[PDB]
Symmetry: none
């Protein structure tokens, strides 16, 4: 009944899925965030002049350009902060090994001492093989072939010695397993501890996953509220006024043609 | 208020002809800015609904299967959220910029229609009035040269003076008909030129007080097209955390180990008194 394969297969499924979570986090920033982090800030932030002479209707354009960039400073944070959490999968994907390679090899050694001792017991099933040949002497003595009784002594002394083996191998193999019913309950209990705390790790480390992106959502949303604030301070009648002084060409009327006379210099 | 755009002759028109070409260069720079932001977000949703829908079969199952899958099914919510963003940018935002681009160029013709008619009519007279003042002040040099030579060479002789009255009629001729008249055709044109030009400055001022309000109301749409995604993403975050509060530790009740009735006493007892006794 080598059913340690079932509790040892539970360990094959604790790291083949932890790999997926760490693969997902490792992928949800290079296949998701290496785009906005890069494309938003990098491809943007030029010195292309807004060329709006309006000191105010220009505050809102750069405000839209700035908050495009103060939106990307927040997807970079997730790219950083969430690849500084996948590094907590390895403090479980390899810390669990500290909790499952210590009381596993220490339990393997005893688990095979049983295996050959029982094989030594089934090998010492000769108490039966000489009992079979003992009875067949007694069976054939009903015919009385006159000194089979000497043979019967032999198998009688033989049976005595060879069950003294069987009783010896049986009491030993008894406590070898009686001390394995005990110690196997300790791996049953220990595995149910760190296969129950792995779930608290999974749940608590995934609850801190959305709280890592919910920050990102509230960041750029709060930054979008800043594009509407910069967009409310605009007062237009003062704006063209400020813009006229720049592009102003002339304020006095083009004086009219007057008829120049003859006595100008007479 | 925009009366103060007169200047010398053509500075005003060219100062106002550069403002429209610069104003148009503001909106097209704003238009393209959406196009660049558009495909950026469009690439964001491509990868996400790729990443979300690229599901695979792994030994996970049970009440913890919800949370892991909750994470996969909310990366497709982001894609849907940010595809709408880019969608709302090229369909609504960019296209409505192309609206005011064309509406205004068609309105920038109606405003100043006959400006070059009067500007060139005013120039024709300006130079032609200068052609006439040119002759008038050459016509008076000769007269002075005939009334100043007679000044030093006084009337001490007997020569017919008809040189003066012959050319005095010229001075009146060239002056009156050709200067006091084209200086009055220029006046009536000028007084209308000031009128029409004053109404063209007023007409673009009104246009400029729209472009500023339009840009504000357009970028306000831009801000709220993004806030659409932000609350969508934020709401789908509690959906992750709603499915994490649903997780109790009973998934280890999903047991596969074959036990509970095994591990017997095992003191093998073949005494071989089964029959033999």
């Amino acid at each position: 009944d080598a059913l340690m394969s079932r509790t040892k297969s539970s360990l094959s499924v604790l790291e083949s899925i932890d790999e997926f979570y760490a693969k997902r986090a490792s992928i949800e920033r290079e296949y998701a965030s290496k785009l906005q982090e890069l494309a938003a800030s990098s491809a943007d932030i030029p010195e292309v002049g807004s060329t709006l002479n309006n000191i105010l209707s220009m505050r809102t354009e750069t405000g839209s350009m700035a908050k495009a960039h103060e939106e990307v400073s927040q997807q970079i944070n997730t790219e950083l902060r969430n690849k500084i959490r996948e590094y907590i999968d390895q403090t479980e994907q390899q810390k669990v090994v500290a909790a499952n390679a210590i009381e596993e090899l220490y339990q393997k050694k005893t688990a095979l001492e049983i295996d050959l001792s029982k094989k030594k017991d089934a090998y010492e099933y000769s108490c039966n093989k000489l009992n079979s040949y003992m009875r067949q002497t007694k069976k054939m003595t009903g015919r009385e072939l006159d000194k089979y009784n000497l043979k019967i002594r032999q198998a009688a002394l033989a049976v005595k010695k060879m069950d003294a083996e069987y009783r010896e191998t049986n009491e030993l193999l008894l406590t070898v397993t009686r001390e394995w019913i005990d110690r196997w309950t300790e791996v049953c209990d220990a595995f149910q501890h760190i296969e129950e705390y792995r779930l608290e790790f999974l749940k608590t480390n995934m609850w801190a996953y959305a709280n890592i992106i919910s920050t990102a959502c509230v960041k750029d949303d709060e930054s979008c509220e800043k594009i509407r604030l910069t967009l409310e301070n605009t007062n237009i009648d003062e704006d063209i006024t400020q813009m006229i002084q720049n592009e102003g060409t002339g304020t006095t009327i083009p004086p009219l043609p007057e008829f120049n006379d003859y006595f100008k210099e007479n």
